[PDB]
Amino acid sequence: MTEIATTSGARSVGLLSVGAYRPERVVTNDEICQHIDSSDEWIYTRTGIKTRRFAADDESAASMATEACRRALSNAGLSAADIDGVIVTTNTHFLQTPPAAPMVAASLGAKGILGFDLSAGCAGFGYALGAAADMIRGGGAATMLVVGTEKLSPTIDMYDRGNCFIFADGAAAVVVGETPFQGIGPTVAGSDGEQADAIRQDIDWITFAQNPSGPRPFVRLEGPAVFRWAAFKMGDVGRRAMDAAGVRPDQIDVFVPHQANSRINELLVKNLQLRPDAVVANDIEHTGNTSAASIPLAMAELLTTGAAKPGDLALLIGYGAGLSYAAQVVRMPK
């Protein structure tokens, strides 16, 4: 006869700021075409990618994540002392343990703060932004870091005619906290674990670890399957996300799909019936596919180029590995 107490946070939460960090090494298509039988033009028309960034040998998903946070914090007018938790979303923290979240908190100056690694393929940001919003409104935190980071280079098979020109590096973090107006709509999510092997690590670490001198694992992609699924299934995912926020297709100002493939995104923009003048993220051009980091990296780009304004109503749609998606309507940060 003693009811467990419940706590409560803020009603309205929003993206206070975005920070982005891309490693300085520019990898061209022609440099990629080195061990590939295709050209710059073939790669740009089929994907929309021109150049992408590769990290340094000493760099890691965590170090870039630490770096993205600082910048977001700086853009937020906030210190590490003002943060209550940090979620790292990544698919390329190359340790089973420890998780990257503590390390990032540690180097940021706030070693004691709550946090975890959330891994859900390319869709990892939608879930982690979703988890923050709910935790903050829940009262477990007031202000929170959600960082997407990905070191994909070391996982690329440079002879792989189907995916080498695709994956890249970068880290972008957002600051989530209380806001006057409601800023982040309901998370709309789900998956398709039937197609789990569409984007995968071909060999598992333990099997590989039993015969290290045999073929090592790489990232593999059954592209047409991914094209079909994404191109035809995310339209509703976007509609469900807009519906839960109480908004209309013609009300979206910025559209931030996962930067997987520009032809896919072209089909979604048309399927989503947005305004003819809706600003549509195209960070694919000089960032490539950065999985968990893709969307917040895309957001920053548009804010930096001034194509998007802070406070613009925006739709987010994450899609990729596991075959799992996540989508939310948000105001633009910064």
Please, are residues 175 and 145 in contact by the beta-carbon 8 Å criterion?
Answer: yes
Nearest CB to ligand D1T, comparing residues 152 and 272: 152
Residue 115 is a binding residue for ligand VZZ (CB under 6 A): no
Residue 46 is a binding residue for a second copy (CB under 8 A): no
Please, are residues 292 and 91 in contact by the beta-carbon 8 Å criterion?
Answer: yes
* Three-state secondary-structure class, residue 283: helix
Residue from 77, 109, 224, 246 that binds ligand VZZ (CB under 6 A)?
A: 224
69 is catalytic: no
Rounded Cα gap, residues 65 and 118, in angstroms: 13
* Three-state secondary-structure class, residue 133: helix
Going by the DSSP 8-state scheme, the letter that residue 216 receives in this structure is P
By a kind-dependent CB cut-off of 5 to 8 A, residue 81 interacts, out of ligand VZZ, ligand D1T, a second copy, none, with none
Residue 138 token pair? 């829940």
Name 58's Cβ contacts closer than 8 Å, sequence gap at least 6.
none
Nearest CB to ligand D1T, comparing residues 75 and 91: 91
Query: Which positions from 231 to 250 touch ligand VZZ by CB under 6 A, shown as an x/- string?
Result: --------------------
Going by the DSSP 8-state scheme, the letter that residue 39 receives in this structure is -
Site for ligand VZZ in 14-53 (CB under 6 A): 46-47
Using alpha carbons only, give the angle 108, 114, 116 rounded to the nearest 5 degrees: 90
**279-280 vs 219-221, strand pairing mode:** unpaired
Residue 277 is a binding residue for a second copy (CB under 8 A): no
Residue from 9, 186, 217, 311 that binds ligand D1T (CB under 6 A)?
A: 217
Q: Give residue 199's Cα distance to chain centre.
A: 16
Residue from 65, 226, 330, 332 that binds ligand VZZ (CB under 6 A)?
A: 226
**Catalytically annotated residue among 75, 122, 164, 261:** 122
* Region near ligand D1T per CB under 6 A, out of 103-111, 185-193, 215-223, 306-314: 215-223
Fill in the amino acid letter for 333: P
* Three-state secondary-structure class, residue 64: helix
Nearest CB to ligand VZZ, comparing residues 44 and 208: 44
**25-28 vs 51-54, strand pairing mode:** antiparallel
Nearest CB to ligand D1T, comparing residues 97 and 211: 97
Nearest CB to ligand D1T, comparing residues 40 and 222: 222
Rounded Cα gap, residues 105 and 89, in angstroms: 14
**Catalytically annotated residue among 163, 164, 258, 265:** 258
By a kind-dependent CB cut-off of 5 to 8 A, residue 310 interacts, out of ligand D1T, a second copy, ligand VZZ, none, with none
Residue 240 is a binding residue for a second copy (CB under 8 A): no
Q: How far is the CB of 252 from a second copy (least distance, A)?
A: 10
* Region near a second copy per CB under 8 A, out of 2-10, 39-47, 156-164, 294-302: 2-10
* Backbone region of residue 210 per phi and psi (left: phi > 0; alpha: psi in -120 to 50; beta: other values): alpha
258 is catalytic: yes
Site for ligand D1T in 89-108 (CB under 6 A): 91-92, 96-97
Rounded Cα gap, residues 85 and 142, in angstroms: 9
75 is catalytic: no
Phi/psi at 238 (5° precision): -65, -40
- Beta partners for 176? 15, 144
Residues of this chain that bind ligand D1T (CB under 6 A): 91-92, 96-97, 121-122, 152, 155, 199, 201, 217-219, 291, 320-321
Residues of this chain that bind ligand VZZ (CB under 6 A): 46-47, 166, 199, 221, 223-224, 226-227, 260-261, 289, 320
